[PDB]
Design a protein around this ligand. Structure first.
Ligand SMILES: Cc1ccc(N2CCN(C)CC2)cc1C(=O)NC1(c2ccnc3ccccc23)CC1
Ligand SMILES: [Zn+2]
Ligand SMILES: [Zn+2]
Ligand SMILES: [Zn+2]
Ligand SMILES: [Zn+2]
Length: 315
């Protein structure tokens, strides 16, 4: 008087939980919201082909809420749905190899994700949420759909929003292991004197104000609360890279003095991005398009550099 089939539910595709489903009911009445391979199967009953398949569900109990925090570092119950929604788009994007890197063919306002994807393939980063690191790896190999969909979900951005590459990175670094990154800087006032300031994690590897990492060790002008103009410089830096950002402006990029950079053209919040990377020569990745040049002069807003351990000589 009731027929049933075996299926496995999961919130991380890693702890599979055996269930038996009633072929006269929908996955919705039995499980709550259900996805099979991204497809919202909530309003559908079990077709017989489903035996043995794995389905994604929302974390209804407290075990799953833990199983899900461990995989994604989220408690937000909308996460699964926002992600599954982005994945419906990103599974259709193309992800070519350009210049030995995984890019994204232009689609639905995704210039800023491609510049972000390209940059992540060129700096040293371990992400803490296993969902991020698995998609990171798989994106290195060309299967970037899940990686991009997770970025959209972590950013509470959605396909078709135009993004900001610096902020996209800052959303992601919060779940990266930068716990041994250290930045010590010294700010010096003609009046007040000198104050050392020592910051760490995400704050140790990100700066907004100047693009030149060289300028940053020499000294950069910052206003002082006490009123005069002060000078801030870098005295120590342990971290494998550094992000230097500043609002778009014409800037020259010299082969071999940097890792890669975000070129942004247009106005606040409606411009386009392209990716500049320093290899044997300068390369410009625009989604599926690439160009080469000896030198580059143009509108740059982030420049990434390599570091291991720096110490100023300024006494
Ligand atoms: C492209 C884009 C999308 C979304 C968003 N916002 C920003 C605020 N945030 C709270 C929400 C998302 C911003 C940009 C954007 O233009 N960013 C850049 C920028 C930063 C700072 N000052 C700028 C000045 C002039 C021109 C560009 C500037 C990199 C180019
Ligand atoms: Zn789309
Ligand atoms: Zn765009
Ligand atoms: Zn986290
Ligand atoms: Zn002062």
């Amino acid at each position: 008087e009731v027929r049933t089939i075996k299926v496995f539910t999961t919130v991380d595709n890693i702890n599979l939980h055996t269930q038996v489903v009633d072929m006269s009911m929908t996955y919705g009445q039995q499980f709550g919201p259900t996805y099979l391979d991204g497809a919202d199967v909530t309003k559908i009953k079990p077709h017989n082909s489903h035996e043995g398949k794995t389905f994604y569900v929302l974390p209804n109990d407290d075990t799953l809420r833990v199983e899900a925090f461990e995989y994604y570092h989220t408690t937000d119950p909308s996460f699964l749905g926002r992600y599954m929604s982005a994945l419906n788009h990103t599974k259709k994007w193309k992800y070519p190899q350009v210049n030995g890197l995984t890019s994204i063919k232009w689609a639905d306002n995704n210039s800023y994700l491609a510049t972000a994807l390209l940059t992540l393939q060129q700096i040293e980063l371990k992400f803490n949420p296993p969902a991020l690191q698995d998609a990171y790896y798989r994106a290195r190999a060309g299967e970037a759909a899940n990686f991009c969909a997770l970025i959209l979900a972590y950013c509470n951005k959605t396909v078709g929003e135009l993004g900001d590459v610096r902020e996209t990175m800052s959303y992601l670094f919060q779940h990266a292991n930068l716990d041994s990154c250290k930045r010590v800087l010294n700010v010096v006032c003609k009046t007040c004197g000198q104050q050392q300031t020592t910051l760490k994690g995400v704050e140790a590897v990100m700066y907004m104000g100047t693009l030149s990492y060289e300028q940053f060790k020499k000294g950069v002008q910052i206003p002082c609360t006490c009123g005069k103009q002060a000078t801030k410089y870098l005295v120590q830096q342990e971290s494998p890279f550094v992000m230097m950002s500043a609002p778009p402006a014409q800037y020259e990029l010299k082969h071999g003095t940097f890792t890669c950079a975000s070129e942004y053209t247009g106005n606040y919040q409606c411009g386009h991005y392209k990716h500049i990377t320093s290899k044997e020569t300068l390369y410009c990745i625009d989604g599926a398009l690439l160009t080469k040049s000896s030198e580059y002069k143009g509108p740059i807003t982030d420049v990434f550099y390599k570091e291991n351990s720096y110490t100023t000589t300024i006494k």
